[PDB]
Design a protein around this ligand. Structure first.
Ligand SMILES: [Cl-]
Lengths: 134, 134
């Protein structure tokens, strides 16, 4: 499982809701059933996938969300980010401005995590069955 | 994950193809997406589900396959036995005669393995990203 991110839209202008601040992909090598991406950032308002990130100096905020085609917020206690089903090798996601905003000039630094959902096995005790054919 | 097996009888020494030698069940209490059953026995003809087992005395062989409704041979290099999707607590499987055979009365032993298929997240290394906003 591996992430890539490429930067988008960093001009000194208003950010529009949905503006891509970064575009990413997650790649999986093993048989898998789906994907999970999140930010290692403060979640806002009890949301799984809506975050506030901070400038390099710690003094300024930008509200963002993770999403894109096929991505759904992860439900339930402890949920983070978004999930998407699929067995294909790679899918794309975006980090987007969440609501129209004016933010302070600076370098904004954030952390993205991800995973591939891989079937694993929990084994039973092997059973040696003696069959009486008679 | 837990296995149980019970021998199944018939009307003589000829075991026709598909005749049951045993029926088992695999029980999975933890949240799971499916089931996997196999034998820890010699495989026949490079096929995941086909096995040959030994009598106690008399140097007799018995050829069997694992299967039953809802089970499919596991595909891929090193595939063992059969798999079946489902989230329910338990499913049944059969051990069946594989090909018509004339089998001497005796004890025939075979080791059955099983597992519950439980999704786990395989983590990517996290990525730091720097967004410069002017
Ligand atoms: Cl929205």
């Amino acid at each position: 499982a591996e992430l890539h991110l490429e930067s988008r839209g960093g001009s000194g202008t208003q950010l529009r809701d949905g503006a891509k601040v970064a575009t990413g992909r997650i790649i999986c090598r093993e048989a898998h059933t789906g994907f999970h991406v999140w930010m290692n950032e403060r979640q806002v308002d009890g949301r799984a996938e809506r975050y506030v990130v901070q400038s390099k100096d710690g003094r300024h905020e930008l509200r963002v969300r993770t999403g894109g085609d096929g991505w759904s917020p992860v439900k339930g206690e402890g949920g983070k980010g978004v999930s998407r089903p699929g067995q294909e090798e790679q899918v794309f996601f975006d980090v987007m401005a969440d609501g129209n905003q004016d933010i302070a000039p600076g370098e904004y630094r954030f952390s993205v995590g991800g995973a591939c959902v891989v079937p694993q096995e929990k084994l039973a005790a092997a059973l040696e069955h003696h069959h009486h054919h008679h």
